[PDB]
Design a protein around this nucleic acid. Structure first.
Ligand SMILES: [K+]
Ligand SMILES: [K+]
Ligand SMILES: [K+]
Ligand SMILES: [K+]
Ligand SMILES: [K+]
Ligand SMILES: [K+]
Ligand SMILES: [K+]
Ligand SMILES: [K+]
Ligand SMILES: [K+]
Ligand SMILES: [Mg+2]
Ligand SMILES: [Mg+2]
Ligand SMILES: [Mg+2]
Ligand SMILES: [Mg+2]
Ligand SMILES: [Mg+2]
Ligand SMILES: [Mg+2]
Ligand SMILES: [Mg+2]
Ligand SMILES: [Mg+2]
Ligand SMILES: [Mg+2]
Ligand SMILES: [Mg+2]
Ligand SMILES: [Mg+2]
Ligand SMILES: [Mg+2]
Ligand SMILES: [Mg+2]
Ligand SMILES: [Mg+2]
Ligand SMILES: [Mg+2]
Ligand SMILES: [Mg+2]
Ligand SMILES: [Mg+2]
Ligand SMILES: [Mg+2]
Ligand SMILES: [Mg+2]
Ligand SMILES: [Mg+2]
Ligand SMILES: [Mg+2]
Ligand SMILES: [Mg+2]
Ligand SMILES: [Mg+2]
Ligand SMILES: [Mg+2]
Ligand SMILES: [Mg+2]
Ligand SMILES: [Mg+2]
Ligand SMILES: [Mg+2]
Ligand SMILES: [Mg+2]
Ligand SMILES: [Mg+2]
Ligand SMILES: [Mg+2]
Ligand SMILES: [Mg+2]
Ligand SMILES: [Mg+2]
Ligand SMILES: [Mg+2]
Ligand SMILES: [Mg+2]
Ligand SMILES: [Mg+2]
Ligand SMILES: [Mg+2]
Ligand SMILES: [Mg+2]
Ligand SMILES: [Mg+2]
Ligand SMILES: [Mg+2]
Ligand SMILES: [Mg+2]
Ligand SMILES: [Mg+2]
Ligand SMILES: [Mg+2]
Ligand SMILES: [Mg+2]
Ligand SMILES: [Mg+2]
Ligand SMILES: [Mg+2]
Lengths: 128, 224, 87, 160, 33, 88
RNA sequence: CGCGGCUCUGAUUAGUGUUAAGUCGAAAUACGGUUCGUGUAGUGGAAGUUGCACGGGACUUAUCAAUGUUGAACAAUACGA
RNA sequence: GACUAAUUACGUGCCAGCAGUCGCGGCAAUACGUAAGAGACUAGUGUUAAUCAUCAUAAAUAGGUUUAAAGGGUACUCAGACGGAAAAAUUCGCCCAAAUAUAGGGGACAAUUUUUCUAGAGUUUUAUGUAAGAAGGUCGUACUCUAGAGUGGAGAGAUAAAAUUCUGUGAUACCUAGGGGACGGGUAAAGGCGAAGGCAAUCUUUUAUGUAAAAACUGACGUCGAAGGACGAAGGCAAAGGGAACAAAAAGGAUUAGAUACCCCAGUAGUCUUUGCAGACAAUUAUGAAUGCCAUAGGUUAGAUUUUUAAUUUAGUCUAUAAAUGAAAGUGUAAGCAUUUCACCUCAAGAGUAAGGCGGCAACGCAGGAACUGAAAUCACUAGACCGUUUCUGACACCAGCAAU
RNA sequence: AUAGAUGAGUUUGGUGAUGGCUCUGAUUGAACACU
């Protein structure tokens, strides 16, 4: 649990939209036809709810759980085979939404390359 | 629905329709009930409709999905906070009997708390201090504590004279041949005597039960 | 129904006490000096922020609790909800 | 969408069944369109945009609602005054016709037939007291207001 | 379904379960298991 | 610890036996007599006193019964006011 | 010519439907006299019956050892079923 | 005869016969046969067969599934259906509005798309509380075996009562010292947890949700979900362990008209461990999941706020009611008002059966008819009667006594 | 096309439901019996 909540701070510090706005070259998606960039109010706090952070937090949980189901006696844990399936389906939905929402922004590619998320993780149907 | 269909609100509509025409078609209708014309122009009042009740206190602004909107609210006044303070500092002030029975409901017509604690129609009680305090705390701009001390001290000097007058009034009466009956100190003790005896009889009769049942606990009935 | 009871256990205890014709004095320590509790110097509740310490002993109504009278539980709740947010 | 109109119809039935003098609705232009038609037809007593608490009952018309911006749009609600005459609600039944699963549209000649109490399409003829509200390009209208303007459109609900 | 009617299904299922046990051998000879 | 529940609607709120059905006051005396015969014997002399007490039982008159207890009448007055209702 | 499908027939054999007047028990409906049913595995001429877990469509059908009070005297022009 | 307009007499006697449905006929039949009368249609009249309608009786219009046919064991999910706020572009869907309408108009709504918004849905801030799950180790009460040629020296255990059975190779009873296997007392509650199945001794390790209050953050990212896959009680199959106790089977002793049985002496699979198979349950709330909404009261569970007394409030759970709803029983955080979506139902019986097929080592599972035969099956309620049902009330009903057969 | 929407017998000790069956209406490129 101490590493779980310590990893949550790493995801907010790495993929936090309040940090990638300045770390990446083109974080936001490209503008559309006629749309012009306008200033918006600043964030009152850190970015903990963006799809990048949530997808990163889900990745840490999927590893901590999938690594326990593969350990000694992990096959005997039949109830948490739903928990792993429920974490992958929660990440599939956010990846599927962020894909069309970000329209290939540099902030979308940073998440994939860093977390190693391949199309198999959201494209088709996750069958476990 | 166990309840029955009450049509009390439609007695006039139902009675006026039954009296419009005659059951024997071809004849004029008979005279209607005598009450039909009496309430002709006095219709019933609307019932069962739930309105937004009076808000005696500001409703919670932060609430986004408030419940109990059609529920009457509690009545609270600025004096409630003051009454609780006084009667908690003077618990034995509750032992002084107070008559909450109304006479004509016109008590507040002769109450001018700018004068003092002694008003017309009401007795000198903890309520007088709260009303006098509230007046000072609002008109003279005093604080809750300052206005409390002032009205509170005026209240003590009046109570002292009331107790000093009982003692002196009885002392002088005997100096001129005045005698009185029994006082509470004596009457109160006599009642304890009569009640103490009842306990003595119970204890004396209840102890015999244990000593008898205790000695008989052993099965010494052989009488060896 | 109106849940009521007789009030003579306290109504008449007040009249029987006042029949003793004795005041209530301040608690003394053990030169018996019976001082009334209604004195203007001791019986006061309104104080000024400039009120120093030497005159804080005369009062009788304090806003804070008596630390020795609280239980170990009531004292922790006090430290957490009254003094901590007053730094 | 049409789901909000369907919730507005069942809610008003439950508020009238409970004999409530006031009732709140989510603040949307679609609900406002139907409420204005109900008020225009005489089924409700008032319409007022406000917060999560009802405005002052007595000063309801002279109530001053604050401007609706993005800082409070989430807490806005439409407050409706309900009528009750002769120990009976004036808005007893609100039966929807077009639903999320199917949007029922009627033509001008079908509305002319339903207005005189003859079935046409998936609708039924109107009887004494019943009303029908159609969502047309000219706004939410009553079936007799629609045939007068000679337009069809989406049928919302039948008000008994 | 009442208990009275469930006892009708109870007998029909037991008679069938009892028939298959009895004919299991000849169904095994004819390759009909 | 929780407080007593509020009884649900009952057909009738009452106690079965209003008056305590006390036991025959001598069935206890006989047990003492039967106790001596088991320890001291039948024709012994120690049990000569308990036997006299047993013979004293039946020679005495039976105490008259007490007046009925009106508890059930008062329980029926406060039923609807003390429980969730009354069953029909 | 071969393989497959389909139709008809087949010693022998199974199931079920109908049929008041036969025979053997008494399983269910009441605490049905071993609670009854679900699943599963056995067992017995038959209905049945046994183990294991489960359901109430069975026990809310529930009804006092708290045993029930001198809760502020008496008398007056007060009080008066 | 009634449905269905229209009657008697005689004959027949559960026979002969009538009959679309219910039915009629057993010696005083308006129902059969004859006679007459009556009620109808008419060159047609009846009957048989078929079709529509009756039949909201496969319900798109327009049904239903707590107890009557009918809710999947479970919810994560691809396809699919449905799903916020304020504007804009496009289609010109939609409407005028047709004649399969060229060309236009109207702009609420609909489809694709764009930009903003934060009420839905989520993330962070170690919540609290908690028998969800899993791993590696233990604790304890009892039981059991062995040993001490222990003490003691004839019974013990079983049952309604017995018998089989245990015991002089020393039992039961009372101890000491070792070994073994499972099980989980109190706490404990209308209590809690998980998608369900299910989960209750203890330490450490390990795992996903959920709940409360404040802020912050993302900005419709949502709900349902055929199929596939996963999980899924007990019993069961397979392999290797374990084996105290319990206990199908097999067997013995009783009871009984007989007794497979209920009871008893014993007792193998099995229950337990590890790895697979299997997938059926009263897998239940006889009630799929989810959303919006409707008046109260009394408890209870985990928080939060407060003048922490006690109130207020969020999310659960239960009891009793109002409006209402229901065939009623009842429900009333739903069996109400509505909506979304999936599953399933279409008289009984045959039948969840047959055949072919698929899955499995097997047991069995999934899927799933028709023939033959019926006018009824079915549900809730009402008043009785009955009970080897409770609690009362009368009677030589019984007890007791005397007499008698 | 604006007159067009209907029931009846039959389950029960009885009542209310559920649910089939049959009759009531119209018809045939019909057949058969009596005419
Ligand atoms: K059923
Ligand atoms: K009949
Ligand atoms: K257009
Ligand atoms: K358009
Ligand atoms: K369960
Ligand atoms: K045994
Ligand atoms: K035997
Ligand atoms: K509650
Ligand atoms: K209903
Ligand atoms: Mg295990
Ligand atoms: Mg043959
Ligand atoms: Mg049985
Ligand atoms: Mg029997
Ligand atoms: Mg039985
Ligand atoms: Mg059984
Ligand atoms: Mg046997
Ligand atoms: Mg029963
Ligand atoms: Mg019952
Ligand atoms: Mg007739
Ligand atoms: Mg004939
Ligand atoms: Mg005849
Ligand atoms: Mg002709
Ligand atoms: Mg279910
Ligand atoms: Mg299944
Ligand atoms: Mg099932
Ligand atoms: Mg935005
Ligand atoms: Mg914001
Ligand atoms: Mg939210
Ligand atoms: Mg915790
Ligand atoms: Mg020896
Ligand atoms: Mg020995
Ligand atoms: Mg052990
Ligand atoms: Mg326990
Ligand atoms: Mg939960
Ligand atoms: Mg879902
Ligand atoms: Mg599936
Ligand atoms: Mg198993
Ligand atoms: Mg096994
Ligand atoms: Mg084995
Ligand atoms: Mg197990
Ligand atoms: Mg499996
Ligand atoms: Mg189960
Ligand atoms: Mg489902
Ligand atoms: Mg619970
Ligand atoms: Mg209830
Ligand atoms: Mg069938
Ligand atoms: Mg078959
Ligand atoms: Mg088959
Ligand atoms: Mg099947
Ligand atoms: Mg009855
Ligand atoms: Mg006799
Ligand atoms: Mg006798
Ligand atoms: Mg003789
Ligand atoms: Mg019956």
């Amino acid at each position: 649990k101490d590493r779980k909540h310590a990893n949550i701070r790493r995801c907010i510090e790495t993929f936090g939209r309040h940090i990638t706005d300045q770390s990446l070259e083109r974080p936001t998606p490209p503008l559309a036809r006629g749309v012009e960039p306008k200033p918006q109010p600043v964030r009152a706090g850190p970015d903990t709810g963006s799809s990048e952070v949530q997808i990163a937090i889900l990745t840490s949980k999927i590893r901590a759980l999938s690594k326990a189901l593969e350990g000694h006696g992990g096959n005997r844990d039949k109830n948490n085979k739903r928990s792993l399936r429920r974490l992958c389906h929660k990440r599939q939905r956010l990846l599927r939404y962020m894909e069309r929402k970000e329209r290939g922004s540099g902030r979308w590619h940073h998440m994939l390359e860093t977390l190693g998320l391949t199309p198999a993780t959201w494209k088709g149907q996750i069958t476990l | 629905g166990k309840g029955r269909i009450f049509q009390a609100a439609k007695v006039y509509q139902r009675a006026s329709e039954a009296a419009a025409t005659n059951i024997v078609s071809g004849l004029p209708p008979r005279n209607p009930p005598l009450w039909l014309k009496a309430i002709e122009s006095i219709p019933p009042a609307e019932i069962n409709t739930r309105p937004y009740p009076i808000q005696h206190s500001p409703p919670n602004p932060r609430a986004r999905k408030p419940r109990n909107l059609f529920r009457p609210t509690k009545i609270v006044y600025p004096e409630d906070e003051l009454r609780r303070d006084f009667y908690r500092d003077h618990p034995w002030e509750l032992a002084r009997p107070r008559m909450i029975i109304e006479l004509d409901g016109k008590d507040a017509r002769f109450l001018d708390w700018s004068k003092g604690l002694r008003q017309r129609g009401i007795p000198l009680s903890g309520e007088s201090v709260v009303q006098r305090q509230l007046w000072l705390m609002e008109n003279q701009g005093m604080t809750k504590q300052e206005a409390y001390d002032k009205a509170r001290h005026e209240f003590y000097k009046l109570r002292q004279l009331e107790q000093m007058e009982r003692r002196i009034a009885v002392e002088e009466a005997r100096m001129v041949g005045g005698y009185f009956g029994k006082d509470l100190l004596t009457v109160g003790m006599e009642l304890e005597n009569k009640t103490y005896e009842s306990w003595k009889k119970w204890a004396t009769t209840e102890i015999a039960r244990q000593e008898s049942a205790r000695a008989s606990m052993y099965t010494n009935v052989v009488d060896n | 129904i109106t849940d009521f009871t007789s009030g003579t256990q306290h109504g008449l205890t007040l009249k029987k006490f006042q029949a003793l014709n004795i005041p209530i004095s301040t608690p003394s320590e053990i030169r018996p000096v019976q001082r009334s509790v209604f004195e203007a110097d001791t019986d006061v509740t309104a104080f000024s922020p400039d009120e120093q310490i030497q005159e804080a002993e005369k009062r009788w109504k304090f806003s804070g609790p008596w630390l020795a009278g609280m239980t170990p539980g009531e004292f922790k709740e006090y430290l957490a909800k009254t003094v901590r947010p007053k730094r | 969408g049409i789901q909000q109109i369907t919730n507005m119809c069942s809610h008003l039935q439950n508020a009238s069944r409970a004999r409530l003098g006031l009732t709140s609705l989510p603040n949307t232009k679609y609900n406002l369109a139907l409420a204005l038609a109900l008020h225009r037809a005489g089924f409700i007593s008032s319409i007022t945009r406000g917060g999560p608490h009802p405005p002052t009952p007595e000063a309801l018309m002279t109530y001053e609602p604050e401007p609706v911006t993005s800082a409070n749009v989430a807490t806005r609600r439409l407050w409706v005054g309900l009528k009750y005459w002769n120990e009976e609600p004036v808005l007893k039944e609100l039966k929807p016709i077009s639903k999320p699963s199917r949007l029922v549209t009627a033509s001008l000649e079908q509305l002319n037939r339903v207005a005189r109490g003859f079935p046409a399409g998936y609708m039924k003829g109107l009887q004494l007291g019943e009303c029908l509200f159609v969502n047309t390009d000219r706004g939410v209208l009553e079936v007799r207001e629609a045939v007068e303007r000679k337009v069809g459109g989406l049928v919302l609900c039948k008000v008994k | 379904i009442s208990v009275r009617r469930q006892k009708k299904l109870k007998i029909k299922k037991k008679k069938y379960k009892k028939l298959m046990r009895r004919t299991r051998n000849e169904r095994r000879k004819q390759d009909r298991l | 610890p929780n407080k007593p529940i509020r009884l649900p609607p009952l057909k009738q709120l009452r106690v079965r036996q209003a008056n305590k059905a006390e036991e025959n006051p001598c069935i206890a005396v006989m047990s003492s007599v039967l106790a001596c015969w088991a320890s001291a014997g039948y024709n012994s002399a120690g049990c000569a006193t308990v036997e006299n007490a047993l013979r004293a039982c039946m020679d005495a008159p039976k105490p008259a019964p007490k007046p009925n207890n009106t508890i059930n009448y008062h329980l029926s007055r406060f039923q609807e006011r003390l429980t969730q209702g009354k069953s029909k």
